[PDB]
Amino acid sequence: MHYQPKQDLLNDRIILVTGASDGIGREAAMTYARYGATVILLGRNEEKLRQVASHINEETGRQPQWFILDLLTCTSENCQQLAQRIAVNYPRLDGVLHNAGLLGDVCPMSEQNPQVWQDVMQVNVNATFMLTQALLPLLLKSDAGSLVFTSSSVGRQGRANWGAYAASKFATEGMMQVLADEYQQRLRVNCINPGGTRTAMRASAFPTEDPQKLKTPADIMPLYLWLMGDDSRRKTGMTFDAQPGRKPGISQ
Amino acid sequence: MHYQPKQDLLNDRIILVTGASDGIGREAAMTYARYGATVILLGRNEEKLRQVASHINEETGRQPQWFILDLLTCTSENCQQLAQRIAVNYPRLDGVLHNAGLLGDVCPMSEQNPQVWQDVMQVNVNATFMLTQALLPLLLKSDAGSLVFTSSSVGRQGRANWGAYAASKFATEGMMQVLADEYQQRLRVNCINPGGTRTAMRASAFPTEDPQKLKTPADIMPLYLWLMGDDSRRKTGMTFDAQPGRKPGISQ
Numbered sequence: 001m002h003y004q005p006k007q008d009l010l011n012d013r014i015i016l017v018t019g020a021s022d023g024i025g026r027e028a029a030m031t032y033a034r035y036g037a038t039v040i041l042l043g044r045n046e047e048k049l050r051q052v053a054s055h056i057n058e059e060t061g062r063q064p065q066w067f068i069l070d071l072l073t074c075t076s077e078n079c080q081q082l083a084q085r086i087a088v089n090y091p092r093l094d095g096v097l098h099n100a101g102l103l104g105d106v107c108p109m110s111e112q113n114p115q116v117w118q119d120v121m122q123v124n125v126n127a128t129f130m131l132t133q134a135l136l137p138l139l140l141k142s143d144a145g146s147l148v149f150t151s152s153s154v155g156r157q158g159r160a161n162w163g164a165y166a167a168s169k170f171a172t173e174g175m176m177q178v179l180a181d182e183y184q185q186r187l188r189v190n191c192i193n194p195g196g197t198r199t200a201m202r203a204s205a206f207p208t209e210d211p212q213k214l215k216t217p218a219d220i221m222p223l224y225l226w227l228m229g230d231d232s233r234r235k236t237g238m239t240f241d242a243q244p245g246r247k248p249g250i251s252q
Numbered sequence: 253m254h255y256q257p258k259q260d261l262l263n264d265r266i267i268l269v270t271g272a273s274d275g276i277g278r279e280a281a282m283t284y285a286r287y288g289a290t291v292i293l294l295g296r297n298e299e300k301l302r303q304v305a306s307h308i309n310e311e312t313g314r315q316p317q318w319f320i321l322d323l324l325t326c327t328s329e330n331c332q333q334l335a336q337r338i339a340v341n342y343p344r345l346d347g348v349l350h351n352a353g354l355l356g357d358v359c360p361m362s363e364q365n366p367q368v369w370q371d372v373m374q375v376n377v378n379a380t381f382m383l384t385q386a387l388l389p390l391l392l393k394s395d396a397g398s399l400v401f402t403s404s405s406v407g408r409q410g411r412a413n414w415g416a417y418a419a420s421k422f423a424t425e426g427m428m429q430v431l432a433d434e435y436q437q438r439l440r441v442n443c444i445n446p447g448g449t450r451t452a453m454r455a456s457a458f459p460t461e462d463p464q465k466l467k468t469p470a471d472i473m474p475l476y477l478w479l480m481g482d483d484s485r486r487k488t489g490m491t492f493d494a495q496p497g498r499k500p501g502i503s504q
């Protein structure tokens with residue numbers, strides 16, 4: 001998506017980003033900030049969140065708040081305590097970008113490791129679900145709350161060596177549609193499939209690949225920017241692609 | 253699907269059916285038997301499996317073997333011990349129908365109960381995955397092993413009150429496609445979405461509904477029969493509907 005907006009586009013918007021410590025999440029949080037947003041960072045590692053908060057401070061003069069939450073093991077209650085902690089400092093939430101993710105094994109189903117498989121379901125689906133349940137209220141208390149999940153090409157068509165991850169992204173799509181058709185004109189709820197992007201995790205699943213050939217988290221930010229502003233205030237229940245017509249695979 | 257075959261159609265086929273104690277699983281197991289198959293019953297409750305085995309005995313003179321396996325709590329190893337127990341008594345497996353399922357809460361995401369949500373993921377996806385991993389070998393040792401999963405209309409498009417269940421069925425579809433494109437010409441791997449059928453579980457999610465209005469597990473057996481015989485030996489990676497053009501909803 002080509003999309004060129006005012007650096008005040010998100011001026012009075014409170015937006016929580018998961019997986020904000022790295023890759024696309026770090027990028028999205030920094031970009032939201034740079035466009036006015038009052039961003040909240042979520043991750044497991046505090047030092048990594050300190051780093052990110054500090055850079056947003058350098059870039060914008062306001063320092064974002066971070067909260068720690070480990071999706072692999074957090075409980076429903078853990079998620080409610082979080083929402084409560086948030087609630088004191090913020091009147092509401094205008095946006096939630098679910099970006100935290102676990103890849104897990106890329107390998108044949110025969111070799112796919114079950115603990116890892118389950119770890120992937122837990123982070124990508126279950127905890128992602130529980131956190132969105134704990135955050136649903138704060139969001140509903142927005143002029144027009146925007147909720148986006150992170151999908152993938154193997155969340156629309158499963159390919160040979162993808163495993164827990166393909167299954168988890170399908171579930172993400174499903175989960176988005178149930179929420180979308182359920183919050184009819186109360187919230188926007190969509191997925192973005194970012195596409196192959198230059199991050200450590202794309203490296204890990206494609207070591208052959210030359211990252212210089214890949215597009216960059218900054219390169220795909222337009223879509224992220226769109227789904228969060230007002231230019232999208234009527235669109236819900238959809239799955240947007242960041243690199244339309246890049247098509248599956250490695251070389252590119 | 254209209255499909256009228258020899259009652260020797262599955263004559264020398266070994267077929268394992270999960271959720272064989274009730275509903276569509278009980279039906280499929282009894283129908284396979286009645287068409288020649290050497291059927292293996294899986295479930296959690298032994299007495300309920302005794303009942304079913306005994307009726308197949310009345311109907312066909314051969315008594316099927318049952319094995320107990322509780323998908324909510326079984327471990328990877330639990331699944332391997334099973335496959336081993338099977339392996340002694342059977343040279344291979346010509347078919348595996350994954351039919352065991354958990355509905356979980358039908359209600360808004362806001363009210364969706366997390367333990368139940370996770371229980372549904374565990375049975376429908378995770379354990380279904382681990383059991384198919386433990387059974388993959390026996391299956392590959394077949395002339396043409398057939399593996400089918402059980403999907404649902406909310407595994408293709410998520411609807412308001414479906415929850416863990418919609419998400420789990422999407423994942424099922426994903427899991428089927430990864431396996432299908434991965435066992436290229438080595439196995440057939442498809443889903444059947446049975447459609448609204450007259451079972452206790454359809455009753456539970458649609459109490460308004462009049463079951464007399466519903467089609468019956470025996471009424472949709474053609475598709476089950478198809479996917480398992482030779483008349484389908486080249487089709488893989490697909491999602492077949494039992495009641496094509498019934499369309500979502502209650503009244504019907």
Ligand SMILES: NC(=O)c1ccc[n+]([C@@H]2O[C@H](COP(=O)([O-])OP(=O)(O)OC[C@H]3O[C@@H](n4cnc5c(N)ncnc54)[C@H](OP(=O)(O)O)[C@@H]3O)[C@@H](O)[C@H]2O)c1
Nearest residue numbers: 019022023024025070071072100101152196197199201202
């Ligand atoms: N980039 C691509 O090629 C592409 C393609 C398909 C899908 N995606 C999707 O893009 C999203 C973001 O990917 P990325 O490449 O930006 O990520 P990344 O930098 O490689 O790492 C993903 C993020 O997830 C977080 N995370 C993992 N486990 C967590 C846990 N248990 N608790 C809390 N946070 C956890 C990590 O935090 P920590 O640093 O603290 O560990 C990390 O910041 C993912 O959901 C992925 O599925 C991207």
Ligand SMILES: NC(=O)c1ccc[n+]([C@@H]2O[C@H](COP(=O)([O-])OP(=O)(O)OC[C@H]3O[C@@H](n4cnc5c(N)ncnc54)[C@H](OP(=O)(O)O)[C@@H]3O)[C@@H](O)[C@H]2O)c1
Nearest residue numbers: 271274275276277322323324352353404448449451453454
């Ligand atoms: N019928 C429909 O309207 C329709 C529509 C959509 C989807 N489906 C699909 O149809 C499939 C079969 O449904 P049905 O109506 O035939 O089923 P059902 O009779 O209502 O019960 C489903 C079966 O799953 C088994 N099961 C549940 N939890 C288990 C566990 N933890 N361990 C082992 N087995 C377990 C049950 O065994 P026990 O008796 O021992 O508890 C039962 O035999 C399901 O996968 C469902 O998703 C059907």
